[PDB]
Design a protein around this ligand. Structure first.
Ligand code: HEC
Length: 81
C-alpha cells in the first residue's frame, strides 16, 4: 500500500517501518492510535504539529490532505498493521 500519504506529504517524512524526520508510521499508529479510535484523538496532534512529543524536528501543521482526501488517509493509517 502507501500512495496517498506519499502523493501529498505524510510519507515525505513518515515511512512504514523506518523514519526520516519524525517517527515512522508503524509506530505513530502503534504508539497512540493502537488502542481505541485514537485516529480521531491524535487527529488533534497531526494538525497541532509536535514539538517535544517524540524528539525529532517539530512537524508543521499538516492534518492529512484537504477535505475528504485527508480522511481517506487516516483510514490507511489505522490499517498499516
Ligand atoms: C516531514 C516534513 C513531515 C511530513 C511531510 C509529515 N510529518 Fe508528521 N511528523 C514529522 C515529524 C518530524 C514528527 C515528529 C515531531 C516531534 O515531536 O518530534 C512528526 C510527527 C507526527 C505525528 C505525531 C504527533 C504526536 O503524537 O505528537 C503525527 C500524528 C503526524 N506526524 C502525522 C502526519 C501526517 C498525517 C502527515 C501527512 C499529512 C504528516 N505527519 C506529514 C514530520 C513530518
Amino acid at each position: 500500500d502507501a500512495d496517498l500519504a506519499k502523493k501529498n506529504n505524510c510519507i515525505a517524512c513518515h515511512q512504514v517501518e523506518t523514519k526520516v524526520v519524525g517517527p515512522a508510521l508503524k509506530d505513530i499508529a502503534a504508539k497512540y492510535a493502537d488502542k481505541d479510535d485514537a485516529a480521531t484523538y491524535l487527529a488533534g496532534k497531526i494538525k497541532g504539529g509536535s514539538s517535544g512529543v517524540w524528539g525529532q524536528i517539530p512537524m508543521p501543521p499538516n492534518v492529512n490532505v484537504s477535505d475528504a482526501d485527508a480522511k481517506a488517509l487516516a483510514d490507511w493509517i489505522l490499517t498499516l498493521k
